[PDB]
């Protein structure tokens, strides 16, 4: 009505919270909560966000595993501190739009509804799909010409990278494919590479340093021969230097960043590098996902390829993706046209401006519309009918 609702997307590696309508998140915290190693207000002594990553008197726990919730009570306390300590907004005087995973169970949605409605007494509640809002965030790259709920969305994060086909707001579970290489695995690959390449780095800061390498200098290349020959022949303009501070001695520690910057980002285009139990490249995964779905919507899925999540913000990822996809596509088209005794298959990998946090952007764009007040399940309907009132979320905005 007069005030604004709150939006909160809980990811595996990072939780994004803020107010709907805003340009960016009001607080983008870490997906971890502090706990004790019980009666009274023992549950009130809970710290969440970045202020829990390195607690020493408490224990740092992780709740959101691979997009799905593992321990409910912990996530409850986390949402508590997210509501009161981080947002500090009146819950009874505000609505809320929560995000779900691609493989979110119905019973899980029911439980989330219970925790949000019974304990918080929220005036509004809406459980949305990630890819649904993602395609909408991708509809904020292309203006008004082609803003549709049809397309194939690939959401890569710290926990799990997935390829989910979306059609008119309705996802096709039978076509959805799961990928093994996630942001944490690329970060880990960088950690091992840096562990094998140079020394003089404290073990208590190794992982963070690796993450830094994945953040600042990491970039995906086109070929695996030239990115190494340019480092072997030149190596004066390519090889970068990284300087950090050892938290232990407060001294300036230094390392050399090079081939790893290409390798880590290359781990997606080739999963065979760091996984013996995975041989499929992302191109093949997307191809099979588009092919194992309805044929009538296949062209639309191949047309609107939307990148969502943080692990897809790496440079020139979608370029190589679209390259391989269009390559295989043109190849198959030629093979089909050689034995034909076919129209041009258009393929486009979209790169949104907020492709890092698209799941939350789409939610903020959905919650800003008047329809979100009509679509969101009311507290009244929740108390009158039951939890089943939050079991099916309507899709509008088209």
């Amino acid at each position: 009505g007069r005030l604004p609702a709150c939006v909160v997307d809980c990811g595996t590696g990072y939780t994004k919270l803020g107010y709907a309508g805003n340009t960016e998140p009001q607080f983008i915290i870490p997906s971890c909560i502090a706990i004790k190693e019980m009666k009274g207000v023992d549950d009130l002594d809970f710290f969440i966000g970045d202020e829990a990553i390195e607690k020493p008197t408490y224990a740092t726990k992780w709740p959101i595993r691979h997009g799905i919730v593992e321990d409910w009570d912990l996530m409850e306390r986390f949402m508590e501190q997210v509501i009161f300590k981080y947002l500090r907004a009146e819950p009874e005087d505000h609505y809320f739009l929560l995000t779900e995973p691609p493989l979110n169970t119905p019973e899980n949605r029911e439980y989330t509804a219970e925790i949000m409605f019974e304990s918080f007494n929220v005036p509004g509640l809406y459980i949305a799909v990630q890819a649904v809002l993602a395609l909408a965030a991708s509809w904020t790259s292309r203006q008004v010409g082609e803003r549709t709920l049809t397309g194939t969305v690939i959401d890569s994060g710290d926990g799990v990278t997935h390829v989910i086909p979306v059609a008119e707001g309705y996802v096709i579970g039978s076509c959805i494919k799961h990928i093994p290489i996630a942001g944490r695995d690329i970060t880990y690959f960088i950690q091992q590479l840096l562990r094998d390449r140079e020394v003089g780095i404290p073990p208590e800061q190794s992982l963070e340093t690796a993450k830094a390498v994945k953040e600042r200098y990491s970039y995906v290349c086109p070929d695996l021969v030239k990115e190494f020959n340019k480092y072997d022949t030149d190596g004066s303009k390519w090889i970068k230097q990284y300087t950090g501070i050892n938290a232990i001695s407060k001294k300036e520690f230094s390392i050399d960043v090079g081939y790893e910057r290409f390798l880590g980002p290359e781990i997606f285009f080739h999963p065979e590098f760091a996984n013996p139990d995975f041989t499929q490249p992302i191109s093949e995964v997307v191809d099979e996902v588009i092919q194992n779905c309805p044929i009538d919507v296949r062209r639309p899925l191949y047309k609107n390829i939307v990148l969502s999540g943080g692990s897809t913000m790496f440079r020139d990822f979608g370029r190589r993706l679209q390259r391989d996809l269009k390559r295989t596509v043109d190849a198959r088209l030629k093979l089909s046209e050689e034995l034909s005794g076919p129209k041009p298959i258009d393929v486009q990998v979209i790169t949104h401006h907020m492709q890092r946090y698209a799941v939350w952007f789409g939610g903020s764009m959905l919650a800003s519309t008047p329809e979100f007040y009509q679509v969101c399940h009311t507290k009244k309907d929740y108390e009158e009918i039951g939890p089943s009132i939050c079991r099916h979320n309507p899709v509008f905005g088209v």
């Binding site: 390449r197 065979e272 590098f273």
Partner: protein, 163 residues
């Protein structure tokens, strides 16, 4: 995908026969060579585990690479360029692996004269690889082995090894 090897009338010995000063069953060698070609894509295929055979030359490239792995693993403890060259001669003189003998980890993939020619070509190839790598491995500063080349000391190509 993975990398492969780039004549119509070319002699062959067994399942796999393509410029060095070491004696062997090797023919005269153009500007680029099989050793140079193998050294070109050495740092890349090492991380790759899966690979497909497209030409007989690919087997030779795989052999040169698998030899380069042990060569670098031995060059890891080098302290001088001359020491690296000598160790290269020692590696070239070594004979511990053979096609379908006591385990080449790829005996499923790959006469007396043929065996002799194969062994001679193997010694010549190993010597050529060691000699060629011995110069590029050491840096101009402090005559020591470079870390950017000793980085692939732990990684194994095609999840197999000669040692």
């Amino acid at each position: 995908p993975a990398y492969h090897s780039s004549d119509p009338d070319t002699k062959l010995i067994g399942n796999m026969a393509l410029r060095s000063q070491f004696k062997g069953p090797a023919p005269r060698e153009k500007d680029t060579d099989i050793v140079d070609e193998a050294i070109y894509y050495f740092k890349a295929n090492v991380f790759f585990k899966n690979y497909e055979i497209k030409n007989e030359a690919d087997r030779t490239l795989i052999y040169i690479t698998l030899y380069i792995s042990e060569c670098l693993k031995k060059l890891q403890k080098c302290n001088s360029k001359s020491q690296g060259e000598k160790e290269m001669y020692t590696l070239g003189i070594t004979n511990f692996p053979i096609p379908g003998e006591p385990g080449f980890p790829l005996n499923a993939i790959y006469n007396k004269q043929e065996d002799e020619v194969m062994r001679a070509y193997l010694q010549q190839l190993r010597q050529e690889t060691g000699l060629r790598l011995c110069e590029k491995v050491f840096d101009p500063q402090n005559d020591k082995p470079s870390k950017w080349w000793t980085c692939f000391v732990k990684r194994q190509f095609m999840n197999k090894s000669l040692s």
